[PDB]
Design a protein around this ligand. Structure first.
Ligand SMILES: OC[C@H]1O[C@@H](O[C@H]2[C@H](O)[C@@H](O)[C@@H](O)O[C@@H]2CO)[C@H](O)[C@@H](O)[C@H]1O
Ligand SMILES: OC[C@H]1O[C@@H](O[C@H]2[C@H](O)[C@@H](O)[C@@H](O)O[C@@H]2CO)[C@H](O)[C@@H](O)[C@H]1O
Lengths: 136, 136
């Protein structure tokens, strides 16, 4: 189920932060934050905290296939507790911060950064805020 | 031309703030921030700063017609200068703040507040940030 979508047709990468605040409703499900590229609505970056297994899975869906999963060692979420996820892009990576701690970096696989125009947030997250900001 | 759109299907009214930061490119054009209701993509609230005439025009587009225009006396924008517009909804009004000063309130005409799921920002605004936040 789609919880939030945003579209910035001029391109929101690189040099933009997305800050999502919210909490899960359960400790048995998952949510995802997806950055999509145009045309094709391919998934340049898929950020997928899975609470049933306490794993953050990151990947990209390009040319009709998921790539190699990048799975973080730590799981700094607590079910039903408010969190803040910030995703900031530079020329080389998406940088992920949770509750103001840097957690992981994901190297760009979709190199056409300016075609990343859309953000989708799906599944088990009760959103309290989404901020999309040009950092430089 | 569409500059930004956001969708929150659970309904982003009442009790939400939208904060838009940016600047115009010219002093001869206009921009608008529209809150849209589902179904129909009717315009529950149209906020339209017009720089050619230095007037903020507010209105609603419901049942295929524009209503009575509500035109603010003051114009607290400067072309090409960064501004911050905050639109906060309670049960009775949209409250508009520009650069942290309250400017105007617009009484709800679309009373089905929970059907307001979509925000669109159009025309002459170079966006630096959009924040959509549940205030209470
Ligand atoms: O890699 C991201 C996608 O994973 C898919 O699930 C994988 C699963 O993580 C992996 O263990 C493997 O065994 O096969 C599954 C199917 O590809 C999800 O279905 C998908 O939504 C993404 O999260
Ligand atoms: O009321 C909001 C809409 O106004 C339309 O322009 C009006 C104009 O403001 C008014 O002076 C009147 O004379 O007729 C025009 C057409 O309705 C805009 O075209 C529309 O985009 C809204 O801003």
């Amino acid at each position: 189920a789609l919880r939030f979508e945003a579209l910035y047709p001029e391109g929101m990468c690189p040099g933009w932060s997305v800050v999502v605040k919210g909490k899960t409703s359960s400790n048995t499900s998952m949510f995802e934050i997806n950055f999509l590229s145009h045309p094709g609505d391919q998934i340049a970056f898929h950020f997928n905290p899975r609470f049933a297994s306490s794993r953050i899975v990151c990947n990209s869906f390009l040319a009709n296939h998921w790539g190699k999963e990048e799975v973080n060692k730590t799981f700094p979420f607590e079910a039903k507790e408010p969190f803040q996820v910030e995703i900031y892009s530079d020329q080389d990576y998406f940088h992920i911060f949770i509750d103001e701690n840097k957690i992981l970096q994901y190297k760009h696989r979709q190199k056409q950064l300016s075609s990343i125009t859309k953000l989708q947030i799906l599944n088990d997250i009760e959103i309290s805020s989404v901020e999309i900001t040009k950092r430089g």
